[model samples]
Target: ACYCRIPACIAGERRYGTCIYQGRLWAFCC
Candidate 1:
């Protein structure tokens, strides 16, 4: 589905909750 693909594409790349901290890429996965 088109809607499903949006989230899938962002999972690996920086499109969702991922952020940059201290001049670097940071993933908030705990």
Candidate 2:
């Protein structure tokens, strides 16, 4: 997973996104 940016959800991050923590990704912010 991507700890920095989502695989295919980067675009949504710039528009209407929250936090993505799935698979091998971890959100240190939470």
Candidate 3:
């Protein structure tokens, strides 16, 4: 799975989502 669940993503300090780049699905954390 490209999407990953994290505590920080819920904490509002970071973001987590699935991204389709080129021809692949990935997850971004920031």
Alpha carbon lDDT of each predicted model: 0.39, 0.38, 0.48
> How much is 3 displaced in model 3, in angstroms?
13
For residues 1-30, what per-residue lDDT tens digits would candidate 2 score against the true structure? Answer: 333443434443432334544555533221
Candidate 2 off by > 4 Å: 1-23
Clashing pairs in 1: none
RMSD of each: 10.0, 8.5, 7.1
lDDT of 3 by residue, 1-30 (tens): 223443224444345566666666554555
TM-score of each predicted structure versus truth: 0.29, 0.17, 0.38
Error of 1 at 1 (Å): 31
Candidate 3 clashes between residue pairs 3 or more apart in a chain or in different chains: none
Highest-lDDT candidate: 3
TM-score of 3: 0.38
Predicted structure 2: clash tally = 0
lDDT of 3: 0.48
What TM-score should be assigned to candidate 2? 0.17
CA RMSD (A), model 3: 7.1
